[PDB]
Structure formats: C-alpha cells, structure tokens
CSV table of C-alpha atoms and ligand atoms in Angstrom, one decimal:
chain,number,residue,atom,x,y,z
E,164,UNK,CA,16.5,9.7,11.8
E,165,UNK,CA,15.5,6.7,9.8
E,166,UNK,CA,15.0,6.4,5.9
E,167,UNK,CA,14.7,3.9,3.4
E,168,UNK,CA,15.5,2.6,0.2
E,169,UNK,CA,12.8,2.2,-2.5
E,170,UNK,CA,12.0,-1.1,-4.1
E,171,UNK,CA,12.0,-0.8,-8.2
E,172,UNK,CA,9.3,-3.7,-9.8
E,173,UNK,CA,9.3,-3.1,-13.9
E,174,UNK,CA,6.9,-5.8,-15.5
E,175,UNK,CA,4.1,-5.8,-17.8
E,176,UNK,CA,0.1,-6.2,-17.2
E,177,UNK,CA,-0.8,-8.7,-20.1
E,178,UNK,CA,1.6,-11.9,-21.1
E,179,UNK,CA,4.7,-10.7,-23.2
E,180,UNK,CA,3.7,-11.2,-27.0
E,181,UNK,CA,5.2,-8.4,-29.4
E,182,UNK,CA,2.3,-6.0,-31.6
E,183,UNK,CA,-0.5,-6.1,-29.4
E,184,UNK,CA,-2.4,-4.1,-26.5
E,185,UNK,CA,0.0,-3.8,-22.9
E,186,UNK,CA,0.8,-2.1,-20.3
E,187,UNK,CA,4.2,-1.4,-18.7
E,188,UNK,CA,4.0,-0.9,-15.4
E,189,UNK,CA,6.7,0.7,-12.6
E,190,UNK,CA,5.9,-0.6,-8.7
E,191,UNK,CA,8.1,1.7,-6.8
E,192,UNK,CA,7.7,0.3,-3.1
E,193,UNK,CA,9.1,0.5,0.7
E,194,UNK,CA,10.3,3.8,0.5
E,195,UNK,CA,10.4,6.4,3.0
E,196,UNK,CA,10.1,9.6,3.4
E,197,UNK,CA,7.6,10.1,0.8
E,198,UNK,CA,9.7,13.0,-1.5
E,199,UNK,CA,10.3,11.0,-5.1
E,200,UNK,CA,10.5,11.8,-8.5
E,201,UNK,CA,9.8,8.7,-11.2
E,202,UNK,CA,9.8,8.9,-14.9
E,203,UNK,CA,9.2,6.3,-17.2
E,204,UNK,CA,11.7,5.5,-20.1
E,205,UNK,CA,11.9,4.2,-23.8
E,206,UNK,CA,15.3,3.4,-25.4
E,207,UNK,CA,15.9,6.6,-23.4
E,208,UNK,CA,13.7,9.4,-24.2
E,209,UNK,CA,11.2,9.7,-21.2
E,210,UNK,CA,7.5,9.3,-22.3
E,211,UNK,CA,5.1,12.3,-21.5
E,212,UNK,CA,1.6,10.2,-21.1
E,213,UNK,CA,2.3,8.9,-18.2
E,214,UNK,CA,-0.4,7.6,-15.3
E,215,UNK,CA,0.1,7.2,-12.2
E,216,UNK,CA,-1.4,5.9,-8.8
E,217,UNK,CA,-1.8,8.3,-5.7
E,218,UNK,CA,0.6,7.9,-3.0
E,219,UNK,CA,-0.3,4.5,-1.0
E,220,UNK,CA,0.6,3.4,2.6
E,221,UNK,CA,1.9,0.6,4.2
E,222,UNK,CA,1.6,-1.1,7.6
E,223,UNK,CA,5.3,-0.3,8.1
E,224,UNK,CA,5.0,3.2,7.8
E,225,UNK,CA,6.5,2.3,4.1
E,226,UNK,CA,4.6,4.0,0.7
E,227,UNK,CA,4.2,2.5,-2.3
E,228,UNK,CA,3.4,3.8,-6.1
E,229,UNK,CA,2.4,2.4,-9.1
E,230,UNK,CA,3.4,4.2,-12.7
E,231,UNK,CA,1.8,2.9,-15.7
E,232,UNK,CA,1.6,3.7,-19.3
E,233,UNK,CA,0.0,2.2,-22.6
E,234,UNK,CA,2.5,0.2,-24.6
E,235,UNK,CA,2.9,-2.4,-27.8
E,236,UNK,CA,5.8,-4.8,-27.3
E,237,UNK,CA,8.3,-4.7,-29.9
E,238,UNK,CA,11.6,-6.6,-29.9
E,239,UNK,CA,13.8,-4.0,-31.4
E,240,UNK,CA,12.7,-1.7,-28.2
E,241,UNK,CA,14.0,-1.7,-24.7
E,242,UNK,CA,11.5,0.5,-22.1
E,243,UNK,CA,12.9,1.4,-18.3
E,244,UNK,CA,12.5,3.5,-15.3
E,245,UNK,CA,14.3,6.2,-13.7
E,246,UNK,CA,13.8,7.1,-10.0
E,247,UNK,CA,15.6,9.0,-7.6
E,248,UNK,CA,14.8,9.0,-4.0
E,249,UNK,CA,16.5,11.3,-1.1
E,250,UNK,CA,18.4,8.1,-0.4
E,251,UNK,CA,20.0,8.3,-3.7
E,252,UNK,CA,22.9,9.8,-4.7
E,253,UNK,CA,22.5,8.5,-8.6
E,254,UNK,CA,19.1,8.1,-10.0
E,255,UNK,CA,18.9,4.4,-10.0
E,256,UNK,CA,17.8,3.6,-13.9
E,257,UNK,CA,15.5,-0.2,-13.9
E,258,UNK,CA,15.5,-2.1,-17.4
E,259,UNK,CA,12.3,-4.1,-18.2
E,260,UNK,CA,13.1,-7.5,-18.2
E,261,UNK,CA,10.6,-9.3,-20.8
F,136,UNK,CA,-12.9,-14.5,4.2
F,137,UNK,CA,-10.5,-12.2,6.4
F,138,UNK,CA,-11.3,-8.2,5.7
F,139,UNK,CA,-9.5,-4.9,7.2
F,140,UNK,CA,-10.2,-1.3,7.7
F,141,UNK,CA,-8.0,1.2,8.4
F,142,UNK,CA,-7.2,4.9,8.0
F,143,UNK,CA,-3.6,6.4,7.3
F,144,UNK,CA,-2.3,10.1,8.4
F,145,UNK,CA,0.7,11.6,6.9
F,146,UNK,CA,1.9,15.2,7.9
F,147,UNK,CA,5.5,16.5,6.4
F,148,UNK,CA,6.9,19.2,8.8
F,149,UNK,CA,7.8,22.1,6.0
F,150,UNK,CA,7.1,20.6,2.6
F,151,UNK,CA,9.4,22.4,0.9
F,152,UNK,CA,7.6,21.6,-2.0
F,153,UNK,CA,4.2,22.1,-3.6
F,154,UNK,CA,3.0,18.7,-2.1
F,155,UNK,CA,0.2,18.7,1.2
F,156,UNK,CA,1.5,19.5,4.5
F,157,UNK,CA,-1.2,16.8,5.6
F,158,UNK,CA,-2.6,13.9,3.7
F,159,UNK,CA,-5.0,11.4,4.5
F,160,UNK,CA,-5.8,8.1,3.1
F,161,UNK,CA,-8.6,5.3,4.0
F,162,UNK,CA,-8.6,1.6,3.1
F,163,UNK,CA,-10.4,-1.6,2.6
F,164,UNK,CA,-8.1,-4.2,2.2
F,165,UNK,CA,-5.3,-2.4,-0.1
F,166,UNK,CA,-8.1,-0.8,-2.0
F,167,UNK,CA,-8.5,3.3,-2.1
F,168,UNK,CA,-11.9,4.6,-0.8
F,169,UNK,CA,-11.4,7.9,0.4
F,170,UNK,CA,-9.0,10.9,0.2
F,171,UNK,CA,-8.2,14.1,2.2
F,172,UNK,CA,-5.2,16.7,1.6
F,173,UNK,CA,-4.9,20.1,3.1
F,174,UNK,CA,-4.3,21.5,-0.7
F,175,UNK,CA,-7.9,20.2,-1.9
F,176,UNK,CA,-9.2,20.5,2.2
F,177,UNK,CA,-12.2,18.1,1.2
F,178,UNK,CA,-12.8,15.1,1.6
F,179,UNK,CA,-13.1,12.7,-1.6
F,180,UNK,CA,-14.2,9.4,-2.6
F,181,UNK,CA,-12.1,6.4,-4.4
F,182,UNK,CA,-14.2,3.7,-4.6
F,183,UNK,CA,-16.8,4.4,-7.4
F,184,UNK,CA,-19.3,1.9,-5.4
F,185,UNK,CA,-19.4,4.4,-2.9
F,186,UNK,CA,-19.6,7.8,-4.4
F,187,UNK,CA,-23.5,7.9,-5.2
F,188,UNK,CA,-24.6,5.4,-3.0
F,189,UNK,CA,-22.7,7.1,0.2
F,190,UNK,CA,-24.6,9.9,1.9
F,191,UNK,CA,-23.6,13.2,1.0
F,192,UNK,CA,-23.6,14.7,4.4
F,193,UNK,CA,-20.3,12.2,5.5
F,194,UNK,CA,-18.5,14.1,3.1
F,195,UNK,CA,-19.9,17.6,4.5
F,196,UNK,CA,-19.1,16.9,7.9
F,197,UNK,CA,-16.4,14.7,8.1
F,198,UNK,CA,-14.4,17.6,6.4
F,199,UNK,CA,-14.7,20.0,9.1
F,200,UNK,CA,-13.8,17.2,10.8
F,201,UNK,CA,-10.8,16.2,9.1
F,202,UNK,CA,-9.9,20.3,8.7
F,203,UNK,CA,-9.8,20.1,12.4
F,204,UNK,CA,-7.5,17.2,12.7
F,205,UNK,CA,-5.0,18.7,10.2
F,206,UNK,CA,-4.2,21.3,12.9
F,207,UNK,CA,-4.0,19.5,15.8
F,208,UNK,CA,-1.9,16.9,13.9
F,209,UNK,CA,0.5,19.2,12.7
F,210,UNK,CA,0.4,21.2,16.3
F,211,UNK,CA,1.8,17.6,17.8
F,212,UNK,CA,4.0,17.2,15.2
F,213,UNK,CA,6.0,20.3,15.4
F,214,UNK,CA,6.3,19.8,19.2
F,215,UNK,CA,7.8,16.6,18.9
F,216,UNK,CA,10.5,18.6,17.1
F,217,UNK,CA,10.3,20.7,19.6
F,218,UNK,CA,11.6,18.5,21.9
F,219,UNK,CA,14.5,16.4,19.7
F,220,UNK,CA,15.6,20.0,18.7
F,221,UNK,CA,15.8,19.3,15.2
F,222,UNK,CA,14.9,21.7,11.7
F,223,UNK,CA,14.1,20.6,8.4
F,224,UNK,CA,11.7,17.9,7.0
F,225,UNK,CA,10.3,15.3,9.2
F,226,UNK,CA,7.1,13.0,8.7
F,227,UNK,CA,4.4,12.3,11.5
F,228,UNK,CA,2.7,9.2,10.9
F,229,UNK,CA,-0.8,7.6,12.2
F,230,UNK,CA,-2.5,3.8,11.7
F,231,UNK,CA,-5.7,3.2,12.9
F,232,UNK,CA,-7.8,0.2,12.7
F,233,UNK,CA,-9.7,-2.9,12.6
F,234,UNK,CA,-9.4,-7.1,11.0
F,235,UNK,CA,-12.6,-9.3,10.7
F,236,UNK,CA,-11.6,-12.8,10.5
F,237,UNK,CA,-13.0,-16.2,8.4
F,238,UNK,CA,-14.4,-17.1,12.1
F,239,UNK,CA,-15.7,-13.6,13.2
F,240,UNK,CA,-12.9,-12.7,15.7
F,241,UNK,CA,-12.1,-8.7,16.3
F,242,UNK,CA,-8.8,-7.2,16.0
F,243,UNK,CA,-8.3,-3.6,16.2
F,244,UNK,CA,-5.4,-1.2,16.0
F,245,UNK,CA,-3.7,2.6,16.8
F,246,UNK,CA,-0.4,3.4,16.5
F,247,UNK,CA,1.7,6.5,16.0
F,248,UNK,CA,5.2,6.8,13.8
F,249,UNK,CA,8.3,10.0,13.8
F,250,UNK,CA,10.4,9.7,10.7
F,251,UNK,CA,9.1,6.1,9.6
F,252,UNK,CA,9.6,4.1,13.1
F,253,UNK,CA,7.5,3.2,15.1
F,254,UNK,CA,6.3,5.5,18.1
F,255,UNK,CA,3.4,5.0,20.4
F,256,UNK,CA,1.7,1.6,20.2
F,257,UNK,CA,-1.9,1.5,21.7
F,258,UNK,CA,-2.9,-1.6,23.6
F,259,UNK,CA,-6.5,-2.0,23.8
F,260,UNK,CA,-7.2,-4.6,25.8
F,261,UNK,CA,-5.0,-3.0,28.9
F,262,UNK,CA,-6.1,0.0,28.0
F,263,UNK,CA,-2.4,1.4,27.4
F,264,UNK,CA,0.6,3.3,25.5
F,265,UNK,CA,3.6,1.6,24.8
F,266,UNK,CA,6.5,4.3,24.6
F,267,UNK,CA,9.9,3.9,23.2
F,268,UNK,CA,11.6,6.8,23.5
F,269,UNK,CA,11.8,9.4,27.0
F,270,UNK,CA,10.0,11.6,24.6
F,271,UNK,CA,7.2,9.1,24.0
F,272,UNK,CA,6.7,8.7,27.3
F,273,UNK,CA,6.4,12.4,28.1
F,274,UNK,CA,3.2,12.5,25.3
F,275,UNK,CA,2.4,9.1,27.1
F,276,UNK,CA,2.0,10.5,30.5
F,277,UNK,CA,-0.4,13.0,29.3
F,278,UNK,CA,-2.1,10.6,27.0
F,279,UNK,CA,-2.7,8.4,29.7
F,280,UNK,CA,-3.9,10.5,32.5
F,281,UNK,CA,-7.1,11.6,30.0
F,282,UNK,CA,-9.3,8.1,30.3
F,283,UNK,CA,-12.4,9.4,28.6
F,284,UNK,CA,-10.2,9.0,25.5
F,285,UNK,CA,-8.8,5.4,26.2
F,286,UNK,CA,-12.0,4.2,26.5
F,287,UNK,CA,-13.7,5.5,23.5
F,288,UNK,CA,-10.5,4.4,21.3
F,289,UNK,CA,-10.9,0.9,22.8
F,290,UNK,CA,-14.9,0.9,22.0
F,291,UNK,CA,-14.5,2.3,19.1
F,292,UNK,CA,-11.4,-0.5,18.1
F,293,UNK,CA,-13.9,-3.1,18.7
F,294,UNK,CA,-17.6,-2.1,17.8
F,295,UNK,CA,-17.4,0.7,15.7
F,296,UNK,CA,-14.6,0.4,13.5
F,297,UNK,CA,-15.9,-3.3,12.8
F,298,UNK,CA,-19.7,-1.5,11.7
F,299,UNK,CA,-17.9,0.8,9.5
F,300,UNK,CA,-15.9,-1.9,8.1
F,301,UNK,CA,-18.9,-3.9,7.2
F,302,UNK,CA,-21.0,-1.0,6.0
F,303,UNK,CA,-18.3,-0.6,3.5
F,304,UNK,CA,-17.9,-4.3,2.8
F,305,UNK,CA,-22.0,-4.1,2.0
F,306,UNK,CA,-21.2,-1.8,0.1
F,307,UNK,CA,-19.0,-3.1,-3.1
F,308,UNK,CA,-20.0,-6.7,-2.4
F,309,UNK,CA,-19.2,-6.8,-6.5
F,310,UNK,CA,-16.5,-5.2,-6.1
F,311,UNK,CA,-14.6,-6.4,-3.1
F,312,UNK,CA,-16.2,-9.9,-2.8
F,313,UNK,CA,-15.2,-10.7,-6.8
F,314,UNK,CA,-13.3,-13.9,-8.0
F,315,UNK,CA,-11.2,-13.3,-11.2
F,316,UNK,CA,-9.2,-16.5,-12.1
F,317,UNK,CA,-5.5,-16.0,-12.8
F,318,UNK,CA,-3.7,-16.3,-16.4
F,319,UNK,CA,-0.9,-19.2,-15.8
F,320,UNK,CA,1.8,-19.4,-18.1
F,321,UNK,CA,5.3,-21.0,-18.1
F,322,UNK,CA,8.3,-19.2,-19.3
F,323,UNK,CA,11.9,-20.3,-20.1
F,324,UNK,CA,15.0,-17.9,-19.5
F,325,UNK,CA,18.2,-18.3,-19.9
F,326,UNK,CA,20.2,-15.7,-17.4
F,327,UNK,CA,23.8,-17.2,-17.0
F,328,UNK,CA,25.7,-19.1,-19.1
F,329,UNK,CA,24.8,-22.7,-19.1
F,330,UNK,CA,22.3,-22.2,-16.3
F,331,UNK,CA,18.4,-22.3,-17.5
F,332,UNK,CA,16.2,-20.7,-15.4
F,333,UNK,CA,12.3,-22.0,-15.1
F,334,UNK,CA,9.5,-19.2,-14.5
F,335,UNK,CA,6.0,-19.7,-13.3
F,336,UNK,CA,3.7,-16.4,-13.6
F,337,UNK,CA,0.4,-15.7,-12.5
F,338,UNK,CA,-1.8,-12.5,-14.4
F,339,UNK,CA,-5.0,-11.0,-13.5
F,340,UNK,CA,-6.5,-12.0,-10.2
F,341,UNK,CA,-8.6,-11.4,-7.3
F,342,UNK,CA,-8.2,-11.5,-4.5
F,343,UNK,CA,-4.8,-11.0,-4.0
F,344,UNK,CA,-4.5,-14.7,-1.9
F,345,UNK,CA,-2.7,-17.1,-3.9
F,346,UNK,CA,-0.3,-20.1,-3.5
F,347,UNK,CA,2.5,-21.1,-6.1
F,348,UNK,CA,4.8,-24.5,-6.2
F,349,UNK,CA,7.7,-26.1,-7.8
F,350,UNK,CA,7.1,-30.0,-8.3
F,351,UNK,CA,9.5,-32.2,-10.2
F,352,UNK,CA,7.8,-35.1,-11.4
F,353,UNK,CA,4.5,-34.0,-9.8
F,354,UNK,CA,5.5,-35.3,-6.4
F,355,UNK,CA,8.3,-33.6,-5.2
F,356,UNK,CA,8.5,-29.9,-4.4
F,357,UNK,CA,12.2,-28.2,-4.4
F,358,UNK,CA,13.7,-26.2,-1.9
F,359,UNK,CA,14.9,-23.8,-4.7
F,360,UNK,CA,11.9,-21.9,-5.2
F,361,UNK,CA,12.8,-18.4,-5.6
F,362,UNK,CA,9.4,-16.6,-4.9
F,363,UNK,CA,8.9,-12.8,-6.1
F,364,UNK,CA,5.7,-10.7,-4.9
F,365,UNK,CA,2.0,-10.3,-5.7
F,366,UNK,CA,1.9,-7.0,-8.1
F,367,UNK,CA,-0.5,-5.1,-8.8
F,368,UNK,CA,-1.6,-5.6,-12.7
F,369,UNK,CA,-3.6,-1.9,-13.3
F,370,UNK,CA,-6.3,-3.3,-14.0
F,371,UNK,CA,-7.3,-4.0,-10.6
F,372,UNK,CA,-6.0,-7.8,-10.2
F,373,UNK,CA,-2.8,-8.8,-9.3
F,374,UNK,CA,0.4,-10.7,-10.6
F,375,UNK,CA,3.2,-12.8,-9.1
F,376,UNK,CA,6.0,-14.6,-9.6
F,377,UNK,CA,8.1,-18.0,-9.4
F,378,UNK,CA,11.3,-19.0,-10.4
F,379,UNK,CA,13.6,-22.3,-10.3
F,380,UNK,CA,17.3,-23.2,-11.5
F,381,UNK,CA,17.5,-26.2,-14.0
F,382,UNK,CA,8.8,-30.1,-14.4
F,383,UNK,CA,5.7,-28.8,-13.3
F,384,UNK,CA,4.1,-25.8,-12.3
F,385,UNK,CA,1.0,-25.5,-9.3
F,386,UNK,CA,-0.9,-22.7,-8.7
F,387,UNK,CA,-3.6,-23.1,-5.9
F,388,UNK,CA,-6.1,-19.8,-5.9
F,389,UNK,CA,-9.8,-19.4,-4.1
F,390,UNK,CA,-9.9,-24.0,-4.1
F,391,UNK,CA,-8.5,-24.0,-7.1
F,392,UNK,CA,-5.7,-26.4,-7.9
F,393,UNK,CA,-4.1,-25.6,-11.4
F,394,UNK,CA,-1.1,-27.9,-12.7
F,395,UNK,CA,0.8,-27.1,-16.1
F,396,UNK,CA,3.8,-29.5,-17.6
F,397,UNK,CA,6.8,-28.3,-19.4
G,250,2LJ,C1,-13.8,9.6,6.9
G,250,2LJ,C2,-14.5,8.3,7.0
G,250,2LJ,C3,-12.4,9.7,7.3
G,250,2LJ,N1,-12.1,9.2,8.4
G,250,2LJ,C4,-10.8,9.2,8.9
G,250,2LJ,C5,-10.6,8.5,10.1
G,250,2LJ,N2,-11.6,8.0,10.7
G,250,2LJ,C6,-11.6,7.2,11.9
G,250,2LJ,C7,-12.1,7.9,13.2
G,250,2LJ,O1,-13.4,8.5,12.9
G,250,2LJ,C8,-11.2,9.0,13.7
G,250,2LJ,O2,-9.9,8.4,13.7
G,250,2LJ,C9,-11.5,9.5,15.1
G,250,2LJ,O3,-10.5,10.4,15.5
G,250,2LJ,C10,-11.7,8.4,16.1
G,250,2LJ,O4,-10.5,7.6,16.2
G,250,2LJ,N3,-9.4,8.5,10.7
G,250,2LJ,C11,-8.2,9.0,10.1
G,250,2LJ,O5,-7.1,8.9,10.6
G,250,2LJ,N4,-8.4,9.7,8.9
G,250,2LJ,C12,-9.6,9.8,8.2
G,250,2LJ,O6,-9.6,10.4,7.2
C-alpha cells in the first residue's frame, strides 16, 4: 500500500498591503488517497465562507486543492490553515507568512 | 505553443463516506472542462466557453456512456482486490491522453494506477502493456490477447484524441490562448538572525510558463537561488516565487525580459 503526504502552500492572491481587497489562499497539493478535511483559520476561530476548488488530478496519480477566502490584511491579525490527512496523526496547522 | 488533453478516472473501493464511489475529471492543460460523479451521474461542464457553444447531445450521450464505465470500472477494481486479498479503502486510478507540440509532433498516453502507483503502462507504438506486478500481468494477458482494442486505443492516441484536443483548443481561443503580464515586486525579509533574505515574486499570469533569476551586478547569476512553485492565484493566473541569502531581479515571461534593482 502506498500513501502520501500533502503539501501545505498559504500565500495571498494580490501583493501584501494592509486595508485593501485580497485573497488568502490554501494550495493543499501531492497528496494521496484523496480522504481530507481542510479548514481555513483566523487568529484561531475557523471562518465559515469558505470556497473552495473541486478535487484536481495530477500526472503522478497525486490531487491537488485550492481553498480560498475574501480577506483585508491587517497587521494586528495572523490567518492559517488546518488540514489533516489519513497520513496524519496531528492535524498539521500552516501560519500565513506575509 | 505546447497544449495537452487528457481525462482522469478515480474510483474509491467503499467510500465510507458521503463522497462518489467514481469520479471523473477532463482537462486542457490544468484547466477544468468537464465533470462526472456517480452522486450527480451526469455529465457537466467547467469551462464556461464550452457550455453553450458545445452540442447538447455530448452531454446526453456521453453520460450513458460514462454510467456505463462507472460499472465496469468499479467491476475491475474490486477484482484486483480480489486478487491481493485485501478489505477496506483502496483507489483505482486511470490517465488517458494526448500532447501537441510548438512543432506539431503527437504524443499520446494510457495508463492505469492501484493505491497511487503506477500499474499498467500502455505502449502505443508496440502496441503493448507494461506490467509490474504478477497481478498486472494476469489483467495483461487478457488485455493483450483482445487486439481490436489495442488498435483502436493506439488510433485513437494519435488521431482522435489530437481532434478533440483542438476542437477544444478552438474553442476558448480567449480563453486558453490569453497573455496576462505578471505583477513583479521585490521583497526584503529578515528570517534568522543576522541573515537577510531577498525575495523575487511574480502575481497574476498566463500562461503558467515563466522563467526567474538571481543576478548580482546584472551579470552574474548565483547558485543560491532557492526556487518555490508556480501557484495558482484564484483568479485564474498564476504566482511564483524566488528567494536568495544576503542585486537584481529577472523575470523572463511569453519574450518578455523584465529586470528590477534593489
Ligand atoms: C466526455 C468528453 C468524457 N470523456 C471521458 C473520456 N473520454 C475519452 C474516451 O472517449 C474514452 O476514454 C474511451 O473509453 C476511449 O478511450 N475518458 C475518461 O476516462 N473519462 C471521461 O469522462
């Protein structure tokens, strides 16, 4: 049997300039099988309106998502990303970098 | 300008969840264009440049079509488990095919995956399976002996597959033959004490092609270029990344050579 470990990408659409139109986006990528639960995150309360991408497929039998939201940048906030995969035992938590 | 076409098949032996026992997925080059699940059992389209201007009737038919498949897929997978003697979940994969090259050179291909490896590799041009288990090669025996079906996966590889591809191509020429210029900016982050880190990013592009350098003093590119991937934005361009322990920053997309100084 052979599984693997998904890939975790937090960044933003639009250039990082705080009180103005974004997007945060979550790229969750080269994972297999395709079972996963994602939820995005801000200072730690999980955010509701939430869209994101039908499952994808990759040339090595990978899959790949993409889970977006509308956001303003402000420095005071910090935004991540939980996921958890059958692969993990602890649902691995991804900070947005800015 | 180097386009592909293929078509992806994923069926997930007890689901155990409320998710298709069968999905099925085409693409143009990393783009959706059309969608089947044995939950819906019909056969939708992505794109939006293809929803009206596509016939009705390849929707119609092509979901019997695909509610045929669904069966006989799922009948192979569960007698591969049959054989390994295993229970649970386990995913049966299918690729299938075809590249168009800058020069006009065909390339077509089928293959066949068991819990995300690869399992049966069709050759085209020796008209052959390549097997890499004793199990493959008991569904490769069988395969083989029925030629009918080699030969119309081989024409289909090369002529068909490519007339579909270009249909499709025709199609969202707006779409799918756009140039968006990418948003360079340079960005200055400090990660470890002491050490300064220099970031080159790219924002909103198409297509995804795209080459980033380095230089230091505009004439000398550095080893230490640590490269990250081409995102996707959301939009429908793309985004990438690239970063250099501490002068200038190039960015070369569709002939375009774009240099920015710190
Ligand atoms: C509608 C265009 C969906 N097609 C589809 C295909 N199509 C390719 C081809 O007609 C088919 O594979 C035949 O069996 C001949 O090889 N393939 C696929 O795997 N999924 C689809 O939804």
């Amino acid at each position: 049997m052979i599984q693997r470990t998904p890939k975790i990408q937090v960044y933003s659409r639009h250039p990082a300039e705080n009180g103005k139109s974004n997007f945060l986006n979550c790229y969750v990528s080269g994972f297999h099988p395709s079972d996963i639960e994602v939820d995005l995150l801000k200072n730690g309360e999980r955010i509701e309106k939430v869209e994101h991408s039908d499952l994808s497929f990759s040339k090595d039998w990978s899959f790949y998502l993409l889970y977006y939201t509308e956001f303003t940048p402000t420095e005071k906030d910090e935004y991540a990303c939980r996921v958890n995969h059958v692969t993990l035992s602890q649902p691995k938590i991804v900070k947005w970098d800015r | 300008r180097t386009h592909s076409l293929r078509y992806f098949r994923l069926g997930v032996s007890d689901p155990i969840h409320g998710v298709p026992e069968f999905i099925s997925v085409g693409y143009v080059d990393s783009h959706p264009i059309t969608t089947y699940d044995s939950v819906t059992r019909q056969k939708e389209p992505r794109a939006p440049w293809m929803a009206e201007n596509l016939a009705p009737d390849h929707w119609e038919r092509y979901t019997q079509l695909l509610r045929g498949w669904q069966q006989m897929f799922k009948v192979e997978l569960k007698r591969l488990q049959r054989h390994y003697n295993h229970s649970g979940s386990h995913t049966y994969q299918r690729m299938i095919g075809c590249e168009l090259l800058e020069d006009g050179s065909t390339t077509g291909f089928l293959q066949y995956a068991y819990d995300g490896q690869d399992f049966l590799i069709f050759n085209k041009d020796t008209l052959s399976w390549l097997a890499v288990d004793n199990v493959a090669h008991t569904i490769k025996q069988a395969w083989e002996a029925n030629q009918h079906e080699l030969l119309y996966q081989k024409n289909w590889l090369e002529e068909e597959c490519i007339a579909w591809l270009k249909r499709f191509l025709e199609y969202g020429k707006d779409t799918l033959q756009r140039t968006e210029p990418p948003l360079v900016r340079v960005n200055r982050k400090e990660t470890f004490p002491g050490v300064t880190a220099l970031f080159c990013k790219a924002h909103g592009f198409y297509p995804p092609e795209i080459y980033m350098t380095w230089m230091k003093n505009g004439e000398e590119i550095v080893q230490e270029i640590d490269y990250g991937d081409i995102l996707p934005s959301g939009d429908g361009t793309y985004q990438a990344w690239a970063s250099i322990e501490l002068y200038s920053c190039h960015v070369e997309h569709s002939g375009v050579h774009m240099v920015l100084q710190v």
